[PDB]
Automatic annotation (TrEMBL), chain A:
Homotetramer. Keywords: DNA damage, DNA recombination, DNA repair, DNA replication, DNA-binding. Plays an important role in DNA replication, recombination and repair. Binds to ssDNA and to an array of partner proteins to recruit them to their sites of action during DNA metabolism. GO terms for molecular function: single-stranded DNA binding. GO terms for cellular component: nucleoid. The keyword DNA-binding applies. GO terms for biological process: DNA recombination; DNA repair; DNA replication. It comes from the Bacteria. This is Single-stranded DNA-binding protein. The chain holds residues 1 to 104 of 167 of the full protein.
Amino acid sequence: MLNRVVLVGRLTKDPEYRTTPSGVSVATFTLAVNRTFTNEADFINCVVFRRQADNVNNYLSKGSLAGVDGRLQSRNYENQEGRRVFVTEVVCDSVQFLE
Amino acid sequence: MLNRVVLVGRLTKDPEYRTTPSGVSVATFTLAVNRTFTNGEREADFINCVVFRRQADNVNNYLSKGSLAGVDGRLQSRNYENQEGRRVFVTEVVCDSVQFLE
Ligand SMILES: O=c1[nH]cc(F)c(=O)[nH]1
């Protein structure tokens, strides 16, 4: 079914590397996406698969402007405090490096 | 900045329909959005949506568990403390429009 999300925002921190529970490598970063209206940003976790993870970790850093096109994915997991965390993330088909 | 979400899916439950403390209609539901790829089995994503005003009224009046719907909106994050004292991070789709597809 149709699942498409597009964002332009600035990274809140330097991107990271991580391995999925199944051992697949990804890059992760958080995008601060300023709203168009007035009463503020939204903070959206993004996930890049395969070698695109290397472009993300080398070209972007905290404050970099980026654009993402991808799909929204839900998952959940138990954190270290033994707590069930529910997340909705953008799994990126492409990341555009705007600056 | 650019922030756009489009989804087609089916409601996992009857929408929840209420009037906020500002006086606006509010509707919430979870859209089960099937993935295009397959594992052979095909998995789904479960996206929390919220709609306000006339679109909320329409959602309550026409959508029910299992209904096919299309949403066009924006992705919003927020924070809250639960009664256990834990910070909970919320990501949901705030719908500008809902399309009824059945
Ligand atoms: O962050 C993630 N994105 C997609 C996945 F399939 C997963 O396991 N973890």
